[PDB]
Design a protein. Structure first.
Lengths: 320, 320
């Protein structure tokens, strides 16, 4: 009966097999615009692999379209306004990768502290004697500043405070101090104190008007020159030209970045030049386990809409 | 009264200041052989920064020499036989870097699981789209095999089993099963079972005739092709040409290496070619905190010998 189009593969094939048991599924990978246009014309549901964009032209051509599902939390690459105008349900698939992002964050904190990429390059260049000039940092007793004490911020705080014996400060205007106590952190109401105290600052807030570009030049000026920034949250929490300035002018010692603004990043991003900035391509939340959870959630919500059942994660509820 | 020669700096200046309060200290850095010969002639004590060698010629020229201290555990670069022959006390400074090496090991396990160096290179090359071909590994529920359940092996096991929710197996013929239970690991008497079960194998044994080259080609053949090797113990625990073969032939998925055989490694080490092997220059145990502990221990033992007091860590006790 119903046809479904996957614009990009899911993060695990289980969701494709689930859809195929109930609908006629077509998958297109890294498609050109004309392939989207030809394949979307008669489908009832669409899945979009982040960060691929789904625009008003494609939505206008999709004469039978009832539901659009993203692959994870982010919907900024979907023209939601055009979908809402045509009564199309947009769902996302959030909150299914807490463990993945927590582990990734720990990996990046440790890689910066142990100067992993730099020391690796030195040894492979024949400069083992770099060990007379550079030492790793011991995490024990250092201060980690967490911005955003939500699901991931809490999980990172708990591991860093207990297993790694770090002092953990958390800034989050919307939680009680008891939430920080639970994970052996201290809630601080003054972001300036977190900035001046922290040896590592890791960003985990929801992206809002309040947190958009909250990490700008003024924030980097307050950080310790020896401190590192980690961002696995959203690219727009950081003002990218200001991070460039902060790295080049040595306002901070380095950064680890999994998220970008814009997404995908341009090929000539000015941050790539700096050996003390390390990158991953928005993969903090994409392990096989997290991908399977997100694939099942995306497939289930598509099937729900096609059967007239309300899905859990509607982004534009006024269409229902 | 007494003069002391530092062949290389200590890992922290506190030990140099402690020595200078009681002796006349000279420091030479990355010295040529003739500088060692001229500076050692009349000193009562010598400190040697790893992995610098102190040979029979230098010891024979050191007419007043009473004590040699290494910087850490390893004494293989000292001609102990020549020192013992002249009645010279050799001390090492062991067991002061458990936390440093534990943290470093975690950093390397996580960096391999999250494909850190590879994904960083891809993004900086403009290949963010590598995220359609490569996914990180989620550590939760995977099996870590620890070889050697001593101070560092136990500390790594405890963090990986509790904080990271890994299944931990330990091989160590000289501990009771209760020691593994304490850190939420399982002791296994069959090394083959650890090899076939593990997704990550991390080496932490003492180097003995039994553990020398225990990780040879036969061992790599039993490991999972998807598994990784981590070595922060001693270079001689691994048969280096066999690790080269294992990496090139894809018997294992990668490795992280902090220790080398020989030390220092040659500039054209065949392992450097492989992007899935990451290196650090024998720095797992050298944070500022661990360096300060080792520097104080080295300075104290030198001063002890110069005052006729027996130091804790004599390597050649038959001279006392
Ligand atoms: N890189 C990835 O692949 C990936 C995957 C999942 C989530 N994320 C992102 O990671 C971040 C954390 O995810 P989560 O599941 O823990 O979200 P969450 O909703 O559980 O927690 C977010 C926290 O941000 C806090 N916050 C709101 N305004 C703040 C402010 N002005 N200052 C400080 N904190 C503020 C909220 O009070 C909340 O506690 C989100 O931005 C999420 O979209 C990224
Ligand atoms: N990379 C560095 O900078 C650095 C720093 C400190 C220590 N190390 C090395 O790390 C390793 C671990 O150090 P540690 O302080 O935990 O030592 P430790 O003496 O506390 O423990 C070593 C363990 O090895 C075990 N062992 C002995 N024979 C074994 C065998 N055949 N198979 C498996 N296990 C066996 C012993 O029973 C013991 O439990 C040592 O080789 C040490 O020299 C490296």
């Amino acid at each position: 009966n119903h046809k479904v189009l996957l614009i990009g593969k899911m993060y695990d094939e289980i969701g494709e097999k689930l859809l195929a048991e109930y609908t006629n599924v077509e998958i297109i990978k890294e498609p050109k615009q004309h392939q989207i246009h030809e394949a979307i014309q008669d489908v009832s549901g669409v899945f979009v692999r982040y960060p691929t964009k789904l625009d008003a032209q494609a939505i206008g051509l999709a004469k039978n379209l009832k539901v659009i599902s993203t692959s994870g939390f982010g919907t900024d690459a979907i023209d939601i306004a055009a979908a809402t105008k045509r009564g199309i349900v947009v769902v996302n698939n959030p909150g299914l990768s807490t463990t993945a992002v927590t582990e990734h964050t720990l990996s990046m904190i440790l890689a910066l502290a142990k100067k992993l990429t730099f020391l690796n390059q030195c040894v492979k260049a024949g400069n083992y004697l770099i060990r007379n000039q550079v030492q790793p940092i011991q995490l024990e007793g250092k201060t980690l500043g967490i911005v955003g004490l939500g699901a991931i911020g809490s999980a990172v705080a708990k591991i860093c405070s207990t297993a790694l014996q770090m002092r953990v400060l958390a800034y989050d205007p919307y939680v009680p101090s008891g939430k920080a106590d639970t994970v052996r952190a201290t809630l601080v109401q003054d972001l300036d104190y977190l900035l001046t105290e922290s040896d590592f600052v890791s960003l985990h807030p929801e992206l809002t008007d309040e947190t958009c570009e909250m990490f700008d030049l003024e924030a980097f000026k307050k950080m310790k020159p020896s401190a590192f920034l980690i961002n696995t949250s959203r690219g727009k929490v950081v003002r990218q030209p200001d991070l460039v300035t902060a790295i080049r002018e040595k306002l901070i010692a380095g950064a680890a970045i999994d998220v970008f603004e814009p997404e995908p990043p341009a090929i000539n991003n000015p941050l790539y030049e700096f050996d003390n900035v390390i990158f991953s391509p928005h993969l903090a939340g994409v392990t096989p386990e997290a991908g399977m959870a997100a694939a099942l959630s995306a497939a289930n919500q598509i099937l729900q809409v096609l059967q007239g059942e309300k899905p859990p994660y509607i982004i534009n509820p006024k269409v229902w």
